[PDB]
Ligand SMILES: CN(C)c1ccncc1
Ligand SMILES: [Zn+2]
Ligand SMILES: [Zn+2]
Protein backbone atom coordinates (compact mmCIF):
# COMPACT_ATOMS: atom_id res chain seq x y z
CA UNK A 1 0.00 0.00 0.00
CA UNK A 2 2.19 2.83 -1.30
CA UNK A 3 -0.15 4.81 -3.57
CA UNK A 4 -3.90 5.67 -3.44
CA UNK A 5 -5.86 3.01 -5.38
CA UNK A 6 -7.84 4.51 -8.28
CA UNK A 7 -10.65 2.10 -7.19
CA UNK A 8 -10.99 3.88 -3.78
CA UNK A 9 -14.37 5.59 -3.29
CA UNK A 10 -14.58 9.39 -3.50
CA UNK A 11 -17.40 11.12 -1.57
CA UNK A 12 -19.07 13.46 -4.09
CA UNK A 13 -21.47 15.33 -1.78
CA UNK A 14 -19.14 18.39 -1.82
CA UNK A 15 -19.22 18.47 -5.67
CA UNK A 16 -23.03 18.33 -6.24
CA UNK A 17 -23.68 22.15 -6.22
CA UNK A 18 -21.21 22.81 -9.11
CA UNK A 19 -21.99 19.32 -10.57
CA UNK A 20 -25.70 18.59 -10.03
CA UNK A 21 -26.74 14.97 -10.51
CA UNK A 22 -23.25 13.62 -9.70
CA UNK A 23 -23.37 9.90 -8.80
CA UNK A 24 -23.07 9.20 -5.09
CA UNK A 25 -21.09 6.03 -5.97
CA UNK A 26 -17.78 7.25 -7.38
CA UNK A 27 -14.14 6.10 -7.59
CA UNK A 28 -10.97 8.07 -8.37
CA UNK A 29 -10.88 6.12 -11.70
CA UNK A 30 -14.27 7.54 -12.75
CA UNK A 31 -13.57 11.05 -11.28
CA UNK A 32 -10.28 11.34 -13.25
CA UNK A 33 -12.15 10.28 -16.44
CA UNK A 34 -14.90 12.88 -15.71
CA UNK A 35 -12.16 15.55 -15.33
CA UNK A 36 -11.14 14.83 -19.00
CA UNK A 37 -8.01 12.72 -18.32
CA UNK A 38 -7.25 9.23 -19.70
CA UNK A 39 -4.85 6.97 -17.74
CA UNK A 40 -4.75 4.12 -20.42
CA UNK A 41 -3.80 1.32 -17.80
CA UNK A 42 -0.33 2.88 -17.47
CA UNK A 43 2.29 1.35 -15.09
CA UNK A 44 4.76 4.23 -15.54
CA UNK A 45 5.21 5.78 -12.07
CA UNK A 46 2.01 7.85 -12.07
CA UNK A 47 -0.78 5.52 -10.78
CA UNK A 48 -3.22 8.21 -9.63
CA UNK A 49 -3.51 12.05 -9.85
CA UNK A 50 -4.77 11.93 -6.18
CA UNK A 51 -2.59 10.83 -3.27
CA UNK A 52 -2.98 9.54 0.32
CA UNK A 53 -2.69 11.78 3.44
CA UNK A 54 0.61 9.98 4.27
CA UNK A 55 2.07 10.67 0.78
CA UNK A 56 0.84 14.31 1.09
CA UNK A 57 2.62 14.67 4.49
CA UNK A 58 5.88 13.36 2.96
CA UNK A 59 5.50 16.03 0.21
CA UNK A 60 4.36 19.00 2.38
CA UNK A 61 6.93 21.27 0.60
CA UNK A 62 4.93 20.71 -2.63
CA UNK A 63 1.59 21.88 -1.16
CA UNK A 64 -0.23 24.59 -3.04
CA UNK A 65 -3.75 25.35 -1.95
CA UNK A 66 -5.98 25.74 -4.97
CA UNK A 67 -9.54 26.97 -5.39
CA UNK A 68 -11.72 27.96 -8.36
CA UNK A 69 -14.75 30.23 -8.04
CA UNK A 70 -17.36 30.91 -10.71
CA UNK A 71 -17.13 34.63 -11.57
CA UNK A 72 -20.44 34.51 -13.47
CA UNK A 73 -18.80 26.51 -16.57
CA UNK A 74 -17.77 26.97 -20.28
CA UNK A 75 -19.95 30.11 -20.54
CA UNK A 76 -18.63 32.05 -17.50
CA UNK A 77 -15.21 33.36 -16.38
CA UNK A 78 -13.43 31.51 -13.55
CA UNK A 79 -11.33 33.01 -10.74
CA UNK A 80 -8.33 30.71 -10.05
CA UNK A 81 -6.86 31.20 -6.57
CA UNK A 82 -3.59 29.81 -5.21
CA UNK A 83 -2.20 29.77 -1.66
CA UNK A 84 0.68 31.97 -3.02
CA UNK A 85 -1.99 34.78 -2.80
CA UNK A 86 -2.46 34.90 -6.59
CA UNK A 87 -5.88 35.24 -8.30
CA UNK A 88 -6.05 34.70 -12.08
CA UNK A 89 -9.20 35.21 -14.17
CA UNK A 90 -9.64 32.72 -17.04
CA UNK A 91 -12.19 33.53 -19.79
CA UNK A 92 -13.38 30.86 -22.27
CA UNK A 93 -13.72 33.41 -25.19
CA UNK A 94 -4.30 39.26 -2.74
CA UNK A 95 -2.91 39.85 -6.27
CA UNK A 96 -5.96 40.28 -8.60
CA UNK A 97 -5.51 39.87 -12.39
CA UNK A 98 -8.12 40.80 -15.08
CA UNK A 99 -9.73 38.14 -17.36
CA UNK A 100 -7.58 36.45 -20.00
CA UNK A 101 -7.93 33.32 -22.18
CA UNK A 102 -6.63 29.94 -20.94
CA UNK A 103 -3.70 29.85 -23.44
CA UNK A 104 -2.05 32.75 -21.55
CA UNK A 105 -3.40 31.86 -18.03
CA UNK A 106 -1.62 28.45 -18.23
CA UNK A 107 1.73 30.18 -19.05
CA UNK A 108 1.29 32.27 -15.83
CA UNK A 109 0.43 29.10 -13.80
CA UNK A 110 3.63 27.31 -14.85
CA UNK A 111 5.78 30.42 -14.05
CA UNK A 112 4.17 30.92 -10.61
CA UNK A 113 4.46 27.25 -9.56
CA UNK A 114 8.05 26.98 -10.91
CA UNK A 115 9.23 30.06 -9.00
CA UNK A 116 7.44 29.02 -5.82
CA UNK A 117 8.56 25.37 -5.91
CA UNK A 118 11.98 24.98 -7.63
CA UNK A 119 13.90 25.32 -4.32
CA UNK A 120 11.28 23.38 -2.27
CA UNK A 121 10.29 20.18 -4.06
CA UNK A 122 10.36 17.92 -7.17
CA UNK A 123 6.55 18.15 -7.56
CA UNK A 124 3.29 20.10 -6.85
CA UNK A 125 0.45 18.81 -4.62
CA UNK A 126 -2.76 20.82 -5.18
CA UNK A 127 -4.50 20.99 -1.81
CA UNK A 128 -8.27 21.21 -2.40
CA UNK A 129 -11.59 21.69 -0.58
CA UNK A 130 -13.20 20.28 -3.74
CA UNK A 131 -16.56 21.65 -4.90
CA UNK A 132 -16.29 20.87 -8.66
CA UNK A 133 -15.00 23.83 -10.73
CA UNK A 134 -11.36 23.33 -9.56
CA UNK A 135 -11.39 19.70 -10.76
CA UNK A 136 -13.10 20.44 -14.09
CA UNK A 137 -10.75 23.40 -14.78
CA UNK A 138 -7.59 21.21 -14.54
CA UNK A 139 -7.88 19.93 -18.16
CA UNK A 140 -7.12 23.53 -19.27
CA UNK A 141 -3.62 23.69 -17.72
CA UNK A 142 -2.61 20.11 -16.79
CA UNK A 143 -1.20 17.31 -19.02
CA UNK A 144 -0.56 13.80 -17.62
CA UNK A 145 1.29 10.65 -18.75
CA UNK A 146 4.31 8.54 -17.88
CA UNK A 147 6.86 9.79 -15.34
CA UNK A 148 9.56 11.66 -17.25
CA UNK A 149 12.86 13.43 -16.72
CA UNK A 150 13.72 17.08 -17.53
CA UNK A 151 15.16 17.90 -21.00
CA UNK A 152 18.01 19.98 -19.45
CA UNK A 153 18.74 17.91 -16.26
CA UNK A 154 18.14 14.64 -14.26
CA UNK A 155 15.18 15.88 -12.16
CA UNK A 156 11.64 14.56 -12.77
CA UNK A 157 9.54 16.59 -15.23
CA UNK A 158 6.89 18.87 -13.72
CA UNK A 159 6.06 20.95 -16.87
CA UNK A 160 5.45 20.40 -20.60
CA UNK A 161 5.73 22.73 -23.60
CA UNK A 162 3.37 22.50 -26.63
CA UNK A 163 5.72 24.87 -28.55
CA UNK A 164 8.77 22.57 -28.31
CA UNK A 165 7.14 19.15 -27.50
CA UNK A 166 9.63 18.88 -24.55
CA UNK A 167 9.49 18.36 -20.73
CA UNK A 168 11.12 20.24 -17.88
CA UNK A 169 11.51 20.40 -14.07
CA UNK A 170 10.68 23.62 -12.05
CA UNK A 171 14.27 24.95 -12.66
CA UNK A 172 14.13 24.72 -16.52
CA UNK A 173 10.51 25.50 -17.39
CA UNK A 174 10.77 29.13 -18.66
CA UNK A 175 8.20 29.57 -21.43
CA UNK A 176 6.52 26.20 -20.67
CA UNK A 177 2.69 26.19 -20.81
CA UNK A 178 1.45 22.95 -19.12
CA UNK A 179 1.69 21.56 -15.58
CA UNK A 180 2.82 17.96 -16.04
CA UNK A 181 1.87 15.08 -13.72
CA UNK A 182 0.71 17.21 -10.76
CA UNK A 183 -0.62 15.58 -7.58
CA UNK A 184 -3.70 16.59 -5.58
CA UNK A 185 -5.58 15.79 -2.41
CA UNK A 186 -9.14 16.68 -1.44
CA UNK A 187 -9.27 17.73 2.26
CA UNK A 188 -13.04 17.24 2.09
CA UNK A 189 -12.42 13.44 1.84
CA UNK A 190 -11.12 13.45 5.44
CA UNK A 191 -14.56 13.61 7.10
CA UNK A 192 -15.51 17.12 8.22
CA UNK A 193 -18.83 18.65 9.21
CA UNK A 194 -19.64 22.04 7.72
CA UNK A 195 -17.92 24.29 5.22
CA UNK A 196 -14.22 25.33 4.79
CA UNK A 197 -14.45 28.59 6.79
CA UNK A 198 -16.13 26.97 9.85
CA UNK A 199 -13.46 24.24 10.05
CA UNK A 200 -10.51 26.61 9.35
CA UNK A 201 -11.72 29.26 11.89
CA UNK A 202 -11.83 26.68 14.71
CA UNK A 203 -7.96 26.67 14.71
CA UNK A 204 -6.88 29.90 13.01
CA UNK A 205 -7.61 33.65 13.37
CA UNK A 206 -4.82 34.90 11.05
CA UNK A 207 -6.43 33.98 7.69
CA UNK A 208 -9.65 35.82 6.95
CA UNK A 209 -12.18 35.33 4.19
CA UNK A 210 -11.88 38.36 1.92
CA UNK A 211 -14.32 36.45 -0.40
CA UNK A 212 -11.77 35.67 -3.20
CA UNK A 213 -10.47 32.29 -4.46
CA UNK A 214 -6.91 32.75 -3.03
CA UNK A 215 -8.41 33.28 0.46
CA UNK A 216 -10.10 29.86 0.22
CA UNK A 217 -6.85 28.33 -1.21
CA UNK A 218 -4.88 29.69 1.78
CA UNK A 219 -7.53 28.48 4.31
CA UNK A 220 -7.53 24.99 2.70
CA UNK A 221 -3.75 24.55 2.93
CA UNK A 222 -3.80 26.02 6.50
CA UNK A 223 -6.48 23.51 7.56
CA UNK A 224 -4.54 20.66 5.90
CA UNK A 225 -1.32 21.74 7.83
CA UNK A 226 -3.34 21.88 11.11
CA UNK A 227 -4.59 18.31 10.61
CA UNK A 228 -1.28 16.83 9.53
CA UNK A 229 1.23 18.77 11.70
CA UNK A 230 -0.58 20.38 14.65
CA UNK A 231 -3.23 17.90 15.96
CA UNK A 232 -1.22 14.98 14.44
CA UNK A 233 2.58 14.95 14.91
CA UNK A 234 4.95 12.51 13.23
CA UNK A 235 8.68 13.02 13.95
CA UNK A 236 9.73 9.75 12.20
CA UNK A 237 9.16 11.16 8.67
CA UNK A 238 12.46 12.25 7.10
CA UNK A 239 12.60 15.08 4.56
CA UNK A 240 15.28 15.54 1.85
CA UNK A 241 18.13 18.08 2.21
CA UNK A 242 17.27 21.18 0.13
CA UNK A 243 19.52 23.89 1.57
CA UNK A 244 21.76 24.62 4.55
CA UNK A 245 20.24 22.00 6.94
CA UNK A 246 23.56 20.38 8.04
CA UNK A 247 25.35 23.74 8.50
CA UNK A 248 22.41 25.22 10.45
CA UNK A 249 22.21 22.14 12.71
CA UNK A 250 25.99 22.17 13.33
CA UNK A 251 25.88 25.94 14.04
CA UNK A 252 23.02 25.44 16.54
CA UNK A 253 25.14 22.90 18.49
CA UNK A 254 28.20 25.23 18.41
CA UNK A 255 26.23 28.31 19.53
CA UNK A 256 24.47 26.34 22.30
CA UNK A 257 27.76 25.07 23.77
CA UNK A 258 29.39 28.53 23.53
CA UNK A 259 26.54 30.46 25.13
CA UNK A 260 25.82 28.05 27.96
CA UNK A 261 29.52 27.52 28.73
CA UNK A 262 30.00 31.33 28.99
CA UNK A 263 26.88 31.85 31.14
CA UNK A 264 28.16 29.20 33.58
CA UNK A 265 31.64 30.82 33.68
CA UNK A 266 30.37 34.41 34.03
CA UNK A 267 27.73 33.83 36.73
CA UNK A 268 28.73 30.44 38.24
CA UNK A 269 25.18 29.09 38.72
CA UNK A 270 25.20 26.05 41.06
CA UNK A 271 22.35 24.38 39.13
CA UNK A 272 21.07 24.34 35.51
CA UNK A 273 17.45 23.31 34.69
CA UNK A 274 17.47 21.98 31.10
CA UNK A 275 13.86 22.15 29.85
CA UNK A 276 12.93 20.61 26.52
CA UNK A 277 13.86 17.62 24.35
CA UNK A 278 13.62 14.32 26.33
CA UNK A 279 16.65 13.08 24.32
CA UNK A 280 18.85 16.12 25.21
CA UNK A 281 22.48 15.61 26.14
CA UNK A 282 24.57 18.02 28.35
CA UNK A 283 25.73 20.73 25.89
CA UNK A 284 28.73 21.66 28.18
CA UNK A 285 29.77 18.20 29.52
CA UNK A 286 32.84 19.51 31.37
CA UNK A 287 30.91 22.21 33.37
CA UNK A 288 30.93 21.99 37.19
CA UNK A 289 27.16 22.71 37.57
CA UNK A 290 24.42 20.31 38.76
CA UNK A 291 22.63 19.44 35.45
CA UNK A 292 18.93 18.55 35.82
CA UNK A 293 16.76 17.57 32.80
CA UNK A 294 12.97 18.09 32.36
CA UNK A 295 11.17 16.45 29.43
CA UNK A 296 9.01 18.46 27.10
CA UNK A 297 8.40 17.58 23.46
CA UNK A 298 8.29 20.54 20.99
CA UNK A 299 4.91 22.31 21.27
CA UNK A 300 3.28 22.44 17.84
CA UNK A 301 -0.07 24.05 18.75
CA UNK A 302 0.20 26.88 21.37
CA UNK A 303 3.36 27.72 23.36
CA UNK A 304 3.71 25.95 26.75
CA UNK A 305 2.40 27.85 29.78
CA UNK A 306 5.32 28.32 32.21
CA UNK A 307 2.78 27.64 35.03
CA UNK A 308 2.10 24.10 33.74
CA UNK A 309 5.79 23.34 32.98
CA UNK A 310 7.01 24.50 36.40
CA UNK A 311 4.14 24.39 38.88
CA UNK A 312 2.04 21.45 40.28
CA UNK A 313 4.81 20.34 42.76
CA UNK A 314 13.06 18.28 40.12
CA UNK A 315 14.90 20.82 42.23
CA UNK A 316 11.25 22.27 42.55
CA UNK A 317 13.00 25.69 42.83
CA UNK A 318 13.48 26.67 39.15
CA UNK A 319 14.27 30.18 40.61
CA UNK A 320 17.62 28.67 41.79
CA UNK A 321 20.45 28.77 39.23
CA UNK A 322 19.63 29.09 35.53
CA UNK A 323 16.97 27.68 33.16
CA UNK A 324 17.91 26.58 29.65
CA UNK A 325 15.08 26.67 27.07
CA UNK A 326 16.69 25.56 23.79
CA UNK A 327 13.81 25.53 21.30
CA UNK A 328 11.30 24.99 24.14
CA UNK A 329 8.57 27.55 23.27
CA UNK A 330 6.95 28.95 26.41
CA UNK A 331 4.49 31.87 26.83
CA UNK A 332 6.75 33.86 29.23
CA UNK A 333 10.29 32.93 30.10
CA UNK A 334 11.48 33.34 33.69
CA UNK A 335 14.15 36.06 34.31
CA UNK A 336 16.93 33.47 35.06
CA UNK A 337 16.88 32.02 31.49
CA UNK A 338 19.09 31.20 28.42
CA UNK A 339 16.72 30.91 25.45
CA UNK A 340 16.83 29.93 21.79
CA UNK A 341 13.41 30.60 20.15
CA UNK A 342 12.67 30.07 16.43
CA UNK A 343 11.18 33.18 14.77
CA UNK A 344 8.26 31.92 12.68
CA UNK A 345 8.21 35.12 10.56
CA UNK A 346 11.55 34.25 8.89
CA UNK A 347 11.53 33.83 5.07
CA UNK A 348 13.43 30.73 3.90
CA UNK A 349 13.19 27.44 1.91
CA UNK A 350 13.09 25.52 5.24
CA UNK A 351 10.25 27.58 6.76
CA UNK A 352 6.82 27.08 5.17
CA UNK A 353 3.67 29.11 6.13
CA UNK A 354 1.70 27.56 8.98
CA UNK A 355 -1.49 27.67 11.08
CA UNK A 356 -2.64 30.60 13.30
CA UNK A 357 0.55 32.64 12.68
CA UNK A 358 2.74 29.60 13.38
CA UNK A 359 5.12 28.15 10.80
CA UNK A 360 6.15 24.71 9.58
CA UNK A 361 9.93 24.43 9.96
CA UNK A 362 11.23 21.56 7.86
CA UNK A 363 14.83 20.59 8.55
CA UNK A 364 15.26 16.79 8.47
CA UNK A 365 11.91 16.52 10.33
CA UNK A 366 8.73 18.67 10.18
CA UNK A 367 8.06 20.92 13.20
CA UNK A 368 5.00 23.19 13.34
CA UNK A 369 6.04 26.09 15.65
CA UNK A 370 3.64 28.44 17.45
CA UNK A 371 3.71 32.11 16.38
CA UNK A 372 6.71 34.16 17.55
CA UNK A 373 5.66 36.58 20.29
CA UNK A 374 8.00 39.36 21.52
CA UNK A 375 6.19 39.50 24.89
CA UNK A 376 7.54 35.99 25.79
CA UNK A 377 10.94 37.72 26.31
CA UNK A 378 9.92 40.64 28.65
CA UNK A 379 12.08 39.33 31.57
CA UNK A 380 15.14 38.87 29.32
CA UNK A 381 17.31 40.83 26.84
CA UNK A 382 18.69 39.93 23.38
CA UNK A 383 21.92 37.91 23.64
CA UNK A 384 24.71 39.83 21.87
CA UNK A 385 27.26 38.10 19.65
CA UNK A 386 30.56 37.09 21.32
CA UNK A 387 33.18 34.38 20.84
CA UNK A 388 34.87 32.89 23.93
CA UNK A 389 37.76 30.46 24.11
CA UNK A 390 40.14 29.29 26.83
CA UNK A 391 41.94 26.88 24.38
CA UNK A 392 45.75 27.36 24.09
CA UNK A 393 47.02 29.85 21.50
CA UNK A 394 48.63 27.39 19.06
CA UNK A 395 48.24 27.37 15.24
CA UNK A 396 48.83 23.63 14.36
CA UNK A 397 48.63 22.58 10.69
CA UNK A 398 43.55 29.36 4.95
CA UNK A 399 45.43 32.67 4.51
CA UNK A 400 45.59 35.47 7.18
CA UNK A 401 44.61 39.15 7.81
CA UNK A 402 45.00 40.18 11.49
CA UNK A 403 41.80 40.16 13.55
CA UNK A 404 40.78 43.12 15.69
CA UNK A 405 37.52 42.69 17.63
CA UNK A 406 36.17 43.73 20.99
CA UNK A 407 34.07 40.47 21.01
CA UNK A 408 36.97 37.92 20.62
CA UNK A 409 37.12 36.97 24.32
CA UNK A 410 40.51 35.17 24.50
CA UNK A 411 43.82 35.36 26.52
CA UNK A 412 45.54 36.67 23.37
CA UNK A 413 43.05 39.53 22.89
CA UNK A 414 43.31 40.26 26.68
CA UNK A 415 47.11 40.41 26.06
CA UNK A 416 46.59 42.90 23.20
CA UNK A 417 46.90 40.73 20.03
CA UNK A 418 44.58 37.97 18.71
CA UNK A 419 46.64 34.88 17.70
CA UNK A 420 46.12 33.10 14.30
CA UNK A 421 44.31 30.10 15.84
CA UNK A 422 41.76 32.21 17.77
CA UNK A 423 41.20 34.50 14.73
CA UNK A 424 40.42 31.45 12.50
CA UNK A 425 38.18 29.98 15.22
CA UNK A 426 36.49 33.36 15.74
CA UNK A 427 35.70 33.73 12.03
CA UNK A 428 34.39 30.17 11.80
CA UNK A 429 32.19 30.80 14.86
CA UNK A 430 30.91 34.14 13.56
CA UNK A 431 29.93 32.33 10.29
CA UNK A 432 28.11 29.53 12.19
CA UNK A 433 26.37 32.16 14.35
CA UNK A 434 25.21 34.23 11.30
CA UNK A 435 23.91 31.07 9.60
CA UNK A 436 21.80 30.17 12.67
CA UNK A 437 20.38 33.72 12.99
CA UNK A 438 19.50 33.99 9.30
CA UNK A 439 17.80 30.55 9.51
CA UNK A 440 15.31 32.20 11.95
CA UNK A 441 16.72 31.43 15.40
CA UNK A 442 16.82 34.19 18.06
CA UNK A 443 18.84 34.15 21.31
CA UNK A 444 17.82 35.71 24.62
CA UNK A 445 19.47 35.80 28.06
CA UNK A 446 19.04 36.94 31.71
CA UNK A 447 19.61 40.75 32.05
CA UNK A 448 22.72 40.35 34.30
CA UNK A 449 24.61 38.52 31.49
CA UNK A 450 27.78 40.47 30.79
CA UNK A 451 30.76 39.25 28.74
CA UNK A 452 33.00 41.63 30.79
CA UNK A 453 32.84 38.88 33.47
CA UNK A 454 34.55 36.40 31.08
CA UNK A 455 37.94 38.24 31.00
CA UNK A 456 38.80 37.24 34.62
CA UNK A 457 38.64 33.51 33.64
CA UNK A 458 42.22 34.24 32.25
CA UNK A 459 44.43 34.56 35.39
C1 LIG B 1 31.71 41.04 39.02
N1 LIG B 1 30.29 41.32 38.96
C2 LIG B 1 29.84 42.60 39.50
C3 LIG B 1 29.41 40.44 38.40
C4 LIG B 1 29.72 39.08 38.22
C5 LIG B 1 28.79 38.24 37.66
N2 LIG B 1 27.57 38.61 37.28
C6 LIG B 1 27.26 39.90 37.46
C7 LIG B 1 28.11 40.83 38.00
ZN1 LIG C 1 15.71 20.46 -15.21
ZN1 LIG D 1 -5.33 29.74 8.68
Ligand SMILES: [Zn+2]
Pocket residue numbers: 392393394410411412413418419420421422
Ligand atom coordinates in the same frame (compact mmCIF):
# COMPACT_ATOMS: atom_id res chain seq x y z
ZN1 LIG E 1 44.90 32.96 21.01
